[PDB]
Ligand binder design. Structure first.
Ligand SMILES: Nc1ncnc2c1ncn2[C@H]1C[C@H](O)[C@@H](COP(=O)(O)OP(=O)(O)OP(=O)(O)O)O1
Ligand SMILES: [Mg+2]
Ligand SMILES: [Mg+2]
Length: 425
DNA sequence: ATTGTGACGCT
DNA sequence: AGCGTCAC
């Protein structure tokens, strides 16, 4: 009724860089632009592992987590850029620095939460109020939304359809009310057009975006029309959108929890969740998950956009698969040193840029044949940015896993050093 | 031999 | 604290 809150209080956007690592390499190397091309890590085992794919290459079936030799079977003219290698491992610095370029531009418009190297949430509520009082009541022109899709429209040529749906949306709009959620979302979309234009002008990079009333819907919306487009998901669009939406497509339901929702309740689509009471969902999935599911299948989610532009952790990882697994003490020490030297470099740069110091060192390892992705995770004190000290401390922390009598067994298939617990400096 | 990250929850 | 989940 009148007291049923509808989750329409905020305007939230999710901005995701289109095939980001590919775009970084295409900016640097113009011969790669507007071509089927991918970014690969390493090169010896089956041509290297593909970690990013241009849309031209995706059209041939090339995907992430495919070996380059196999991708070339699907796409013989595929062009490749290789991740930089330093100290014997992939080094992602070029892409982190490109990400900072983009995040700093986004921060001019609004508060952002860095969700990953190429994705950020945007809290647009106050920016929209400012822009609405700036409008002082005139309507919003289609010309202000040149790359926006309105999900669910038109109802009742891809670009022609986009424009039909946008016209239907704008003709319906009630610009009289500075508190209409649909109007607020529309102004949000105008601002995100401007943000995306600024990113492309000032970096060369293109991105897609979603605009809705919360983070989950904004991320879902972002996925609906890619690349280089943005999508508005209104509250009213949720029943139809969710009526055929697989549960696994909603952020956080792509794993075991979503699988159990499907199996326990005997449903397939998000919208089917509305039939259950909050207490029923809590009985199957716990108090927190159940309340979250009850609201989310109605389009309602409360998770705030956190004011956080910088990562909370600075980590360095390397897998040693198959016969490259580490089998001697010297090997383990040398790779701990390699990881620690990259970590020291990134930490010293982080301290200069961002006025903070990490205080905890996490050391994690995998042992051969262990079913888990991480076998062991132990922490120690991080007191100075010294690679030799950090590597000696990581070894001191993990050495009691060695069961032998200069040899290391069982061989180690992953090493991981992470700097955490930052404090202002 | 589907890597190298990074965020968050549980107990 | 250490382990597990989730999403790229
Ligand atoms: N599993 C992974 N391993 C390594 N790097 C990854 C992985 N997933 C994503 N990345 C990196 C490379 C991507 O360019 C970047 C952004 O990831 P993501 O947003 O899913 O895809 P994308 O930006 O390449 O394409 P899209 O246009 O679909 O967003 O992060
Ligand atoms: Mg992306
Ligand atoms: Mg992304």
């Amino acid at each position: 009724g009148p007291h049923m809150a509808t989750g329409q209080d905020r305007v939230v956007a999710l901005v995701d860089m289109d095939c980001f690592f590919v775009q970084v390499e295409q900016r640097q190397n113009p011969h790669l632009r507007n071509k089927p091309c991918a970014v690969v890590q390493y090169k010896s085992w089956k041509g290297g592992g593909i970690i990013a794919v241009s849309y031209e290459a995706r059209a041939f079936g090339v995907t992430r987590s495919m070996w380059a030799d196999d991708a070339k079977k699907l796409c013989p003219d595929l062009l490749l850029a290789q991740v930089r290698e330093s100290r014997g491992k992939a080094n992602l610095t070029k892409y982190r620095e490109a990400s900072v370029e983009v995040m700093e531009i986004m921060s001019r418009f609004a508060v952002i939460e860095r969700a990953s190297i190429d994705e950020a949430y945007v809290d647009l509520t106050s920016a929209v109020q400012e822009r609405l009082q700036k409008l002082q009541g005139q309507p919003i022109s289609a010309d202000l939304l040149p790359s926006t899709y309105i999900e669910g429209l038109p109802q009742g040529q891809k670009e022609g359809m986009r424009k039909q749906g946008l016209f239907q949306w704008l003709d319906s709009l009630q610009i009289d009310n500075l508190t209409s959620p649909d109007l607020q979302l529309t102004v949000g979309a105008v601002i995100v057009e401007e943000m995306r234009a600024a990113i492309e002008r000032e970096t060369g990079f293109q991105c897609s975006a979603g605009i809705s009333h919360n983070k989950v819907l904004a991320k879902l919306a972002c996925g609906l029309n890619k690349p280089n487009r943005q999508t508005l998901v209104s509250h009213g669009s949720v029943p139809q959108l969710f009526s055929q939406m697989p549960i696994r497509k909603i952020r956080s339901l792509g794993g075991k929890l979503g699988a159990s929702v499907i199996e326990i309740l005997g449903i397939e689509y998000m919208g089917e969740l509305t039939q259950f009471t909050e207490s029923q969902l809590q009985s199957h999935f716990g108090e927190k998950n159940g309340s979250w599911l009850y609201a989310m299948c109605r389009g309602i989610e409360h998770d705030p956009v956190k004011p956080r532009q910088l990562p909370k952790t600075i980590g360095c990882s390397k897998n040693f698969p198959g016969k490259t697994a580490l089998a001697t003490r010297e090997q383990v020490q040398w790779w701990l040193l390699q990881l620690a030297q990259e970590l020291e470099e990134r930490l010293t740069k982080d301290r200069n840029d961002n006025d903070r110091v990490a205080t905890q060192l996490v050391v994690s390892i995998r042992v051969q044949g262990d079913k888990r992705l991480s076998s062991l995770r132990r922490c120690c004190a991080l007191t100075r940015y010294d690679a030799h000290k950090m590597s000696h401390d990581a070894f001191t922390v993990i050495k009691n896993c060695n069961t032998s009598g200069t040899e290391w067994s069982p061989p180690l298939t992953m090493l991981f050093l992470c700097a955490t617990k930052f404090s202002a400096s």
